[PDB]
Amino acid sequence: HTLVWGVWVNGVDQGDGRNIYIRSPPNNNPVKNLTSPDMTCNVDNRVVPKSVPVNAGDTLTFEWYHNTRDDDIIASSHHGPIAVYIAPAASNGQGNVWVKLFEDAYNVTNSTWAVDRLITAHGQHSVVVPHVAPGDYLFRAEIIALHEADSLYSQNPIRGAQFYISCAQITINSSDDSTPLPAGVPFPGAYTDSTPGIQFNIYTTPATSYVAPPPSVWSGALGGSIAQVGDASLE
């Protein structure tokens, strides 16, 4: 159970984004139905009134929280991976539009899932904004909690992988557009019951064998990290 509070740009807090530049759902409940339109941008997908300005090469940091800002972030039990996608905003997330910018699953050295490291980062994970055409975009941050992923939702509706999905409205102002955005994958549609990473037993299969759902990260992606960039308690 987790939600996005807002974003930072180049280490500068852009302020509470909930229902303002984030298409926030009404609460922190997971999405589980892999075919639902809720997979796109969660259960309340509509245009919200603001879009955060960035330039190509900027560091965009999502900040998650559980009940209040900068709390325990997400329950520890919720091991799993974190991804970020982008699409043109005009799509409203419909069609084959989502392009992956970031994936982090399990880090062998540190022995930590992305979710574990997100807790230690105070809810903060980042991407560098790619060199796409200036204009309005949706960045879709997705946490997959795997604590009940040994079943499939479609077979047992009281279990299954959980998806915590947040869409931010981002406007890209300066960019030389050297890597125009390709077509991507649909959500819903990209993850099915047989997609690697959806059904997985984290209790008996070792984490080093986990493979995160495709698609793979776009070559035009500029990386990203899970790490605190700003101190919320100072605001």
Ligand X SMILES: OC[C@H]1O[C@@H](O[C@H]2[C@H](O)[C@@H](O)[C@H](O[C@H]3[C@H](O)[C@@H](O)[C@H](O[C@H]4[C@H](O)[C@@H](O)[C@H](O[C@H]5[C@H](O)[C@@H](O)[C@H](O)O[C@@H]5CO)O[C@@H]4CO)O[C@@H]3CO)O[C@@H]2CO)[C@H](O)[C@@H](O)[C@@H]1O
Query: Which conformational region is residue 66 in: left (phi greater than 0), alpha (psi within -120 to 50 degrees), or beta?
Result: alpha
Q: Which of 16, 26, 67, 111 binds ligand X (CB under 6 A)?
A: 67
Confirm or deny that 125 is annotated as ligand binding.
no
Give me the numbers of helices (H) and strands (E) for the chain, helices first please: 2, 12
Residue 155 interacting with ligand X (CB under 6 A): no
Residue 193 interacting with ligand X (CB under 6 A): no
Residue 148 interacting with ligand X (CB under 6 A): yes
Query: What phi and psi values does residue 6 have, to the nearest 5 degrees?
Result: 180, -165
Confirm or deny that 129 is annotated as ligand binding.
yes
Residue 159 interacting with Cu ion (CB under 5 A): no
If we measure between CA atoms, which residue out of 124, 80, 84 comes closest to residue 102?
84
Residues 1-30 that bind Cu ion (CB under 5 A): 1
The DSSP code for 193 is T
Confirm or deny that 79 is annotated as ligand binding.
no
Nearer to Cl ion, 26 or 223 (CB): 26
Confirm or deny that 140 is annotated as ligand binding.
yes
Confirm or deny that 162 is annotated as ligand binding.
yes
Give the three-state DSSP class for 41: helix
Residue 66 interacting with ligand X (CB under 6 A): yes
- Rounded CA-CA distance 152/165 in Å is 18
Contact (CB, 8 A) for 118 and 73: yes
Binding site for ligand X (CB under 6 A): 1, 28, 66-67, 75, 77, 147-148, 150, 203
* Residues annotated within a binding site for (1,4-beta-D-glucosyl)n: 9, 47-48, 58, 67, 129, 140
Binding site for Cl ion (CB under 5 A): 68-69
